[PDB]
Design a protein around this ligand. Structure first.
Ligand code: GNP
Ligand code: ZN
Lengths: 113, 50, 311
RNA sequence: AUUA
């Protein structure tokens, strides 16, 4: 029995861009985790097709980091809506265990294709 | 200062390990032998290779 | 009547299948083995007691037992379909044991079984546990493993202080006979990780799902993702296996001409001292999916923890 | 593993 994160995690909200300050209002289903020391996001989802940048606000507001993203992946989802496409991203430097956590939770709690 | 210069110039930047300077430029060799069985396997005869 | 002699020829496959039961009928077999557990209420690396397995040893031409077993287990119906799907996705890898899914009735009902073919008696976790929890009062597993692979003979243990390192320094030569097995296991692990990444499967790799030949099985805790976006988790595996890599000297074959133990040694020039590319090649060959930056020269490290990690 |  070596499971990949039984107790799951919660939440997805906020913003994104492509050239530093291009993050205007909200262009990301920035996914998961509010750790015990503070809010630390793990996964990013994009109904758009090309983004390299984002800006997640937290706590002080003045401290909101211009995160560097990585080349995306694409998949289609089995939502009740029907045809729905996003382009997946992870925050750069995210270790293997965290990506496994978010992928397993996303695939096993909500239906995808 | 001729063998040392000959092996220094072959180096790609002038740096060489210290453990190979006596191994390739020394003129004299000293061997310490515990017993006869070891002697007949290392320096038997009048000339040997090492 | 029937059952035992019909389950025997149903487990018996299509290749040669000269099988003999391990003192059972149609019931399971109970053993005492080491596992690596994490299931939200228990955790650790200890020796539990296996319960649901039937084992059949295999014979050969001269009717003498060999180191090959057929392990068949029974469980629910959903795990049957899940494991069948994952195996169907992963069956073409040359580092995956050959599975066989069938259905057989023990009563008026029909229950499903999963049979694995040509495994060994002990896994890698058994070897790691035996070497990391040594006790000269009872070390039967280590002795059995040493004698079944021609590392020594059964009369080597009639000596006293045969295990000591200061007295009898020949135990180092005795231990250094498993290095090639360990190296082949590492290569097969890298192959399995590549296959998992290409097939789009997410899972965590443990030491008790690999036998001493390198083959992998037990896809019961895996999930599915889009192809090309798989990710294996290999932290505990490498971290627990690390101390055994130097005891058995697993990387001895890398000093020969073609990584072959039957060819002469490599002849480096005496003026070479960098070796910065060989270290990277070795890391990429044996530790490909270990995800943490590696600095061959510790002058580029970020702090003392990174210095320890790279050293 | 002791969830089969
Ligand atoms: N290799 C081998 N293992 C055996 C044998 N007999 C019993 N076992 C034990 O049976 C266990 C098989 O468990 P298995 O369900 O296949 O994998 P698992 O590690 O329990 N994880 P999960 O089933 O939740 O996915 C192994 O850990 C092994 O130690 C044998 O003859 N050969
Ligand atoms: Zn470092």
């Amino acid at each position: 029995n070596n499971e990949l994160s039984p107790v799951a995690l919660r939440q997805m909200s906020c913003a994104a861009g492509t050239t530093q300050t291009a993050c205007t209002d909200d262009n990301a289903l920035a996914y998961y985790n509010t750790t015990k020391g503070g809010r630390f996001v793990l996964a990013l989802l994009s109904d758009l097709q090309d983004l390299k940048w984002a800006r997640f606000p937290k706590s002080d507001g003045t401290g909101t980091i211009y995160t560097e993203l990585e080349p995306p992946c694409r998949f289609v989802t089995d939502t009740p809506k029907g045809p729905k496409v996003k382009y997946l991203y992870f925050i750069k430097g995210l270790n293997n265990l965290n990506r496994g956590m978010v992928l397993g939770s996303l695939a096993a709690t909500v239906r995808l294709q | 200062n001729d063998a040392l210069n000959n092996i220094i110039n072959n180096a790609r930047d002038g740096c060489v390990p210290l453990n190979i300077i006596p191994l390739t430029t020394a003129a004299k060799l000293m061997v310490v032998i515990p017993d006869y069985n070891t002697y007949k396997n290392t320096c038997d005869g009048t000339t040997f290779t090492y | 009547s029937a059952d035992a002699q019909s389950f025997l020829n149903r487990v018996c496959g299509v290749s040669a299948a000269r099988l003999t039961p391990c003192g059972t009928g149609t019931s399971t077999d109970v053993v005492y083995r080491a596992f690596d557990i994490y299931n939200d209420k228990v955790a650790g690396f200890a020796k539990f007691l296996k319960t649901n397995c039937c084992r059949f040893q295999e014979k050969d031409e001269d009717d003498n037992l060999i180191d090959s077993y057929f392990v068949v287990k029974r469980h629910t119906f959903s795990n049957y379909q899940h494991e069948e799907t994952i195996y169907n996705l992963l069956k073409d890898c040359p580092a995956v044991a050959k599975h066989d899914f069938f259905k057989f009735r023990i009563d008026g009902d029909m229950v499903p079984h999963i049979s694995r073919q040509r495994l060994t008696k002990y896994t890698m976790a058994d070897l790691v546990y035996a070497l990391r929890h040594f006790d000269e009062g009872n070390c039967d597993t280590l002795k059995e493993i040493l004698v079944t692979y021609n590392c020594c003979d059964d009369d080597y243990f009639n000596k006293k202080d045969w295990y000591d390192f200061v007295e009898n320094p020949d135990i180092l030569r005795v231990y250094a006979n498993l290095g090639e097995r360990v190296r082949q296991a590492l290569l097969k692990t890298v192959q399995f990780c590549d296959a998992m990444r290409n097939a789009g499967i997410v899972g965590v790799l443990t030491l008790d799902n690999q036998d001493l030949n390198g083959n992998w099985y037990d896809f019961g805790d895996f999930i599915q993702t889009t192809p090309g976006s798989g990710v294996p988790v290999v932290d505990s595996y490498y971290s627990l296996l690390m101390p055994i890599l130097t005891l058995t000297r697993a990387l001895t074959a890398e000093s020969h001409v073609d990584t072959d133990l039957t060819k002469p040694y490599i002849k480096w020039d005496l003026l070479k001292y960098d070796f910065t590319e060989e270290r990277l090649k070795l890391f990429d060959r044996y530790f490909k999916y270990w995800d943490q930056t590696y600095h061959p020269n510790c002058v580029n490290c970020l702090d003392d923890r990174c210095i320890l990690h790279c050293a």
